[PDB]
Symmetry: D2
Subunit: 373 residues, 4 copies
């Protein structure tokens, strides 16, 4: 009765991720010029067409076409490949009055919804091992593509990693990869390259190297990008988060300014959860926050430590409440979300990014949590 | 307090419009051609509806007429939206992998992970938070169309928080935001919603003393895609188990059954639901993983959350002997080529006692019982 | 030498595709609703076809299906173009002006100036340069469809220069550019075109020693909207009199008859053509001007170029007594609500001995003669 | 009674907006890259502006910012239109034909026929009907921007009918339709337009008793692309000679000078205008035809309408000795790579005494005179 858990990732060239990138590149340009921007940018990319839509109210001007090209050119496309449509509508004044309170010391929630923060002790990143390996696999392939160490491949790619959790020590069951390749590729070269990368990633995490490898199970993958499959913003929300190990309330991240609690509260919840595990109050922690549009604080909260709590759950809940300010305006500012760049997190997950220096990944609340328990 | 919260969205919500259109298109295709390959994605923003995705079909679907079928009942007309149709054709590199030469097997439409889930909390075998969230909006929409509830528009959301600290659940909070006319009467509006909140609570034998949050924005006249952009597959948690179950990431609407994101999810719900109805567990969650072109799942995990009535090993073993995991086989077993998907593009795909879905049938309890 | 030149373009030319689609749309509207107001403009550029304009109608036209009717014969398929449909309704401020309270009169759809023209040079009563330019491309397209001329595509142009120094006209130059396949045979292609050039010259009893310019680019494989953008109403001189006659500016395709740019131009051609057929002149040009909402022309000018057989005053006077200048009346006299316009969206709107156009009928010669 | 009529349209007219955007785009391209190949077509309908066409250039033009430059002065804002950009690349099969191996010649960008025209009726050497039609709308637009004429919008048309029965012309009718605000004052509106009609007539020493048609629709509040779709190159007669001259069909806006539809038309106007200013004819019309990839006209015809003051043979002969008909040469002679085209996308491309256009210069009169003597 093996216990096999599986998570996936997608590359920079994947059509859903292109949209996520463009949406966050646009957000970045807005916030860079106007830190009171309201931005809710959604992008569609389908065979020859990229539609840039959403609601924005901003003093900035963003050259939407130039921005799309910044993301698309490194993947291998040129200025004649896509028709670009710009349908940028302003934020609804009925929404704005509710978020931007008369009392300028409070920001009301950008929308209702539910978010989940999650953390665990399985990796240095405090993330499920399946997610971390899935992302690392694709990062390493993309890096080798750009360095030209791995040739005759294109940017569109997916990974799936199954891990065996039956014992105290995890075993990799299966590593799967689909990468878009050139017509004139060499399968032997391609297969040896991927395998070497699969083993290197396993060795780097001190794992077994005897796992089953599924390399390009379709048998052929030359048609790819938005030509092969349509892309949309926010259609990789589980890849963006915790790889199906954690729960998810439904909200997407990319293209959203921090007033959209779907994004800021999720980073806040990860911040809490991650620090809770780093403080060794639990092996795993999941935090659920719910919001109501226009209300400055969460409407409901739940902490779940999965029965891995080292101290009484009551004292964990109580430490969290005394160590964190749950006012939306306050946690936005505490996490420096108005000045953070989001493009780097539009690829390879928003969480456990030891390659980045994200505000919500900092273990700068362990002392307060410890002390308050 | 242990407070768990789920949400729902109405027929007029912009994400749900796109989901409706995507599934209305699928329906037309499959109705004409049951070997259609369909992966329709829709965007709706301000004055624009883009209909895109990959389709290979012998059918012809009048994409504009279809968009209107969905949009007219919400109150829009033929001059409100520019319609763009960008239908691409399924990639031949994908098709060769899915359609094996001998039609004996179908390979998986894509890699990924799906989750089925079921529990004993409701007659629908669904989390109470989800069920209440959906029922709330169904009842508002029904009253809107009957004209019992006036001066409201179709765009709406709900959020239901339930207290699970005790053996008997309590409703903590019911929240509703509904789009209203400029000349609405707030008193009328607030009394109407409250009555509906209590009726939904009474119908599930629940407490009636819960906090009510009604239009916390204070104004909600601009709505629809004018207020907020919509896209297909951006309501995947509302579509499924309201954040109580896990999710592997795949959306449902606009996809033919070769896309295992949809078919395997319905299959997993079918399994999980029958497991709970057979009383082998109070809750069950099944995770299946796929590889593109492979006819069976690549991995499987059953989790009963320590609510198993018999040995977990025997539950896993009963599932394996009671269900055929071949993709082509479970598609046919669930009648997915002939099922209509538009009715599930609103108000969740699971626990629909208002519908007659193949994957909601408790027709596998006997086989599961017998095989343990 | 007096060398006069006119051009034509083929069914596959991008401007003409738009003209075809615009008139195919009009046709569908009028076929269902003869009180349709239609002003359909179309753009076709590399992978995109935008269908726009103002329409008020009880009809429904499947704009995508219609675009395909026009594009399929040229060799395109259902995946070649993104279709955008942006059909806006007719302005109510315009409508009140055109549709008078008094239902006996229709006001002019817009201001502007139109020109009718006719001459005695051809059986069609059209300039010889125009007729030859159009015949050339018709014959190439017919041979393409019959498969007598292979390895060519539908996009093509012609230009015909004629020498008018003497009493008998001489062809100076015939020019043709046709889009060809990559693997075409130039020798075959050149012999084919030449034979067609000579056949067209022989059919009009003309010299056969003219210079031939065949595909002066040297290569013409990229064509259609991929090579060059197309728009409705960008072929107005090819549509009319090949630069021999004047033009006031208004385009024809996509317009219902309330748009005087179209109906008054056909009416002016009708007058002019009958004047020449009555032998009151060898050439005749009629200029009518309109004001929006006014049921009759605001100004009028007849020019017979000093080829008048009787006094000009008596020619003007015969015209006035032989024709009703009320807009509603000449629309009905010419049967414009029930005429099909797609056939005239290619190969000119005038002198179409291949068609049976109301405005080409010599049914006013007796009245003109009698009234002088 | 011999009544000739011409029309004009305003800055806010939907066809003209597209023409403006097309030429504003061209301008940006040429400003950055003088070897640009540009063929930009624009559609504007209801809430949508599509920017399409084929461009090969080292430039980058922010198409959205450019559309706004044109649309903001008319009264629109950044939320009014969905903008689509479908810029395609010039066809390499066309480019090889235009950009000859011999870098000293440019082949014609396309086949076609152009017409230059000039006459002695006005200081601009243009038909009186055209001049009056354009002046009327310029003066309305100027007053709109100065705020002398209020509660009007930029979309507008004019039509001027003139009586040519006698030696001295008479204005028959002046017509104007202007888009107005809902709360306008008709009396104010009618007095304003009339004053402008009379001022324009007096300025050309014409009669002032003509019939005035002012907003014959009775209502014109819905306007712009909302009221009526716009496309590039659907005002080719307003752009040229108001239906007095002939036209071969090609449009001007959005085209670089390799498109002979534009450059050869300016060249033909240049010739014709100088021919009339040299007093060799009262009216002159020049017809040039081209073949794609050929560096010179394929055919040429001068028509003086029997108004030639000297023998026609000597006129034809002077033209040939005074003008170089090589395409590359006349492009350079007219400075077409460095000319701005946005100013001519409104109020006609010809007889613009308000501008300094290369093709309006009477700098070939001396050579024509000199070459037409025995
Ligand atoms: C361009 S911005 C503001 C520009 C000006 N710089 C200012 O200070 O206000 C005004 C509106 O444009 C809309 N908009 C449309 N396209 C846009 C783009 N690419 N970048 C920014 N705003 C855009 C937004 O809705 C925004 O409220
Ligand atoms: C397989 S497609 C999914 C559905 C597709 N929309 C259709 O028409 O069936 C999803 C992903 O597969 C990857 N992909 C595309 N073609 C593939 C192929 N032939 N083999 C393996 N992977 C592929 C791309 O990254 C793409 O995002
Ligand atoms: C729609 S079918 C029509 C022909 C039909 N197979 C017959 O012969 O009876 C042709 C192809 O066009 C594409 N298509 C484009 N737009 C479509 C639409 N609106 N409805 C259906 N298919 C469309 C699909 O990719 C499909 O494979
Ligand atoms: C709040 S919006 C999302 C963000 C939005 N794109 C923006 O610019 O802020 C999401 C939903 O809220 C609901 N909604 C829109 N306007 C609202 C308002 N003024 N008050 C309450 N709910 C509203 C609609 O169902 C809509 O899909
Ligand atoms: C579409 S028709 C009536 C269609 C009919 N009720 C049906 O069931 O399909 C009525 C109005 O809608 C607008 N319209 C928008 N798109 C249209 C299309 N493709 N064909 C016809 N009318 C369209 C027109 O302006 C017209 O005045
Ligand atoms: C030459 S194009 C217009 C110029 C174009 N927009 C540019 O970027 O130069 C006009 C027409 O030429 C014809 N055409 C296209 N390519 C051609 C070629 N290589 N040789 C001759 N004719 C051609 C087609 O009929 C097309 O509509
Ligand atoms: C942007 S340009 C050249 C930019 C490049 N940095 C260079 O200097 O060569 C390359 C091509 O992009 C296409 N393009 C698409 N949109 C464009 C725009 N707004 N401006 C210029 N070119 C555009 C044109 O076909 C042009 O030839
Ligand atoms: C009236 S439209 C002609 C065709 C129009 N698409 C239709 O549906 O009938 C042409 C032009 O007239 C002007 N126009 C628009 N609305 C008008 C109105 N109500 N009365 C007079 N002129 C108008 C605008 O300049 C517009 O560019
Ligand atoms: K997709
Ligand atoms: K063109
Ligand atoms: K129009
Ligand atoms: Mg949300
Ligand atoms: Mg996707
Ligand atoms: Mg959404
Ligand atoms: Mg998926
Ligand atoms: Mg064209
Ligand atoms: Mg007109
Ligand atoms: Mg127009
Ligand atoms: Mg031309």
């Amino acid at each position: 009765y093996k216990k096999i858990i599986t998570s996936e990732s997608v590359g920079a060239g994947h059509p859903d991720k292109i949209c996520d990138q463009i949406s966050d590149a646009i957000l970045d340009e807005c916030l860079s010029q106007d830190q009171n921007s309201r931005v809710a940018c959604e992008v569609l990319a389908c065979n020859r067409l990229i539609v840039i839509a959403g609601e924005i109210t901003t003093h900035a001007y963003v050259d939407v076409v130039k921005t799309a090209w910044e993301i698309i050119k490194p993947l291998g496309y040129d200025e004649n490949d896509f028709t670009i449509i710009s349908n940028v509508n302003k934020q609804s004044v009925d929404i704005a009055q509710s978020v931007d309170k008369t009392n300028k010391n409070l920001i009301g929630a950008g929308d209702q919804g539910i978010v989940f923060g999650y953390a665990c002790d399985e990796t240095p990143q405090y993330m499920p091992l399946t997610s971390v390996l899935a992302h690392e696999l694709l990062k390493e392939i993309e890096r080798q593509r750009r360095s030209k160490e791995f040739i005759k491949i294109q940017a569109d790619m997916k990974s799936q990693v199954s891990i065996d959790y039956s014992n105290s020590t995890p075993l990799i069951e299966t590593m799967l990869v689909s990468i878009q390749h050139d017509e004139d590729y060499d399968v032997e070269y391609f297969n040896k390259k991927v395998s070497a990368i699969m083993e290197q990633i396993a060795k780097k995490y001190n794992l077994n190297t005897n796992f089953k490898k599924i390399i390009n199970s379709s048998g052929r993958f030359v048609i790819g990008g938005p030509i092969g499959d349509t892309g949309l913003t926010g259609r990789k929300i589980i890849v963006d988060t915790y790889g199906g190990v954690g729960h998810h309330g439904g909200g997407a991240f990319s293209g959203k300014d921090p007033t959209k609690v779907d994004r800021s509260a999720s980073y806040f919840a990860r911040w809490i959860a991650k620090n809770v595990v780093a403080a060794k109050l639990a092996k795993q922690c999941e935090i659920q926050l719910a919001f109501a549009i226009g209300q400055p604080q969460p409407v409901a909260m739940y902490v779940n430590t999965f029965n891995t709590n080292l101290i009484d759950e009551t004292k964990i809940f109580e430490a969290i409440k005394k160590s964190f300010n749950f006012d939306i305006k306050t946690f936005i500012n505490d996490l420096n979300l108005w000045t953070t760049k989001y493009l780097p997190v539009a690829t390879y997950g928003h969480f456990g990014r030891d390659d980045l220096d994200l505000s919500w990944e900092k273990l700068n609340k362990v002392e307060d949590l410890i002390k308050n328990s």
